[PDB]
A paper describes a structure:
Factor H binding protein (fHbp) is a 27 kDa surface lipoprotein consisting of two β-barrels that promotes resistance against complement mediated lysis and is a key meningococcal antigen that elicits SBAs. We have shown previously that fH CCP 6 and 7 (fH67) are necessary for high affinity interactions with V1 fHbp, and that these two CCPs are sufficient to inhibit binding of full length fH to fHbp. Here we characterised members of the three variant families by identifying amino acids that are critical for fH binding and through structural analysis, to inform future vaccine design and to understand the basis of the interaction of fHbp with fH. Here we show that even though V1, 2 and V3 fHbps exhibit remarkably conserved atomic structures, differences in key amino acids necessary for interactions with fH are only revealed by functional studies.
Author numbering:
A (entry chain D): 81 to 126, 126A, 126B, 126C, 127 to 210, 212 to 321
B (entry chain A): 324 to 443
């Protein structure tokens, strides 16, 4: 963890080696990650600064303490703080933020307790739509949410049919398993392979999931899903790989 | 059926993934963020935008937030106080100083404080 925050990038590391955090840095401010006495700050502007994911364990969530800051009238104030969760794969990563506290609107130098969980972004070598293999592929990995890091992802993609489906299992905060309904595989603006569809409780629609394909042969998937139970929105980080 | 949301002073998270799937059916929702100097109606930098029968909800996803600046030649009882778009605050200047054009209050507008909180 400490090494990921201080040590530089080397080829000898088990990939994904480098990860950019632009989507986790709000209001053109800074993000500071801290773990095991180490610290690193990320500014919204530059894309050259990145997290050394090569030092982190593969197929596991790495937890760093986070603080999102903004500069106002010479003074720098804390926008939010909590736990930064990173799930690492060989060619991909899923970033989620467990917000514990936000800036006190009445006393800006202080903080108020407000809990929210957001899947803020992804990272890795995206699969080009023209790099899709033939036939089918199966993916297995993690599903994680607010105080729920042991869910499982099962996912199948028919490349010929340009379609995928799957399931999220073992999420304690969710009454049923979440069905990842049959969805269309499309090319996005950068010609990368993506899937987006419905999340269900059996046949009943509850939200949306979307996945991006990673690696030159679509070895991995990484994305996010939502479940709406009444008025509460549950955000879920999902990532899998071909076994 | 809601088309891609034009979130003024914000935008969607995972924009690249979500963009090819518009329009979305009623009941669909997406996580969104607010830019610098802006915030969600809940007072956070992010929330969810919903596709309702009346269109996208919240209707105004991103609201201006104005921080009260340090006043040279003014009283600093409101320094580092956050005000949301539409809210006004009295400006207390030191004797011999005033807000320009005989103003007594500043208001948080879509583009910041109006007028600028300054004791000449």
């Amino acid at each position: 963890l400490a090494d990921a925050l201080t040590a530089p990038l080397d080829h000898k590391d088990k990939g994904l080696k480098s990860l950019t955090l632009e989507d986790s840095i709000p209001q053109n401010g800074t993000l500071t990650l801290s773990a095991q006495g180490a610290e690193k700050t990320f500014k919204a502007g530059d894309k050259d600064n990145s997290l050394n994911t090569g030092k982190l364990k593969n197929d596991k969530i790495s937890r760093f303490d986070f603080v999102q800051k903004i500069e106002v009238d010479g003074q720098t104030i804390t926008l939010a703080s909590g736990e930064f969760q990173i799930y690492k794969q060989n060619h991909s990563a899923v970033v989620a933020l467990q917000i514990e506290k936000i800036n006190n609107p009445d006393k800006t130098d202080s903080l108020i307790n407000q809990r929210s969980f957001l899947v803020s972004g992804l990272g890795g070598e995206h699969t080009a739509f023209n790099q899709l293999p033939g036939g089918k592929a199966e993916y297995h990995g993690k599903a994680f949410s607010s105080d729920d890091p042991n869910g499982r992802l099962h996912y199948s993609i028919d490349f010929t049919k340009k379609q995928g489906y799957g399931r999220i299992e073992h999420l304690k905060t969710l009454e049923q398993n979440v069905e990842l309904a049959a969805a269309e595989l499309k090319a996005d603006e950068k010609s990368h392979a993506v899937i987006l569809g419905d999340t269900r409780y059996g046949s009943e629609e509850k939200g949306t999931y979307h996945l991006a394909l990673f690696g030159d042969r679509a070895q991995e998937i990484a994305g996010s899903a939502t479940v709406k139970i009444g008025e509460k929105v549950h955000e879920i980080g999902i990532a899998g790989k071909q076994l | 059926p809601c088309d891609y949301p034009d979130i003024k002073h914000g935008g969607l998270y995972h924009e690249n993934m979500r963009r090819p799937y518009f329009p979305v059916a009623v009941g669909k929702y997406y996580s969104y963020y607010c830019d610098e100097h802006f915030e969600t109606p809940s007072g956070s930098y992010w929330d969810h935008i919903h596709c309702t029968q009346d269109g996208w909800s919240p209707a105004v996803p991103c609201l201006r937030k104005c921080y009260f600046p340090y006043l040279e030649n003014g009283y600093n009882q409101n320094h580092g106080r956050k005000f949301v778009q539409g809210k006004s605050i009295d400006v207390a200047c030191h004797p011999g100083y005033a807000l320009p054009k005989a103003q007594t209050t500043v208001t948080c507008m879509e583009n910041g404080w109006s007028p600028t909180p300054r004791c000449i």
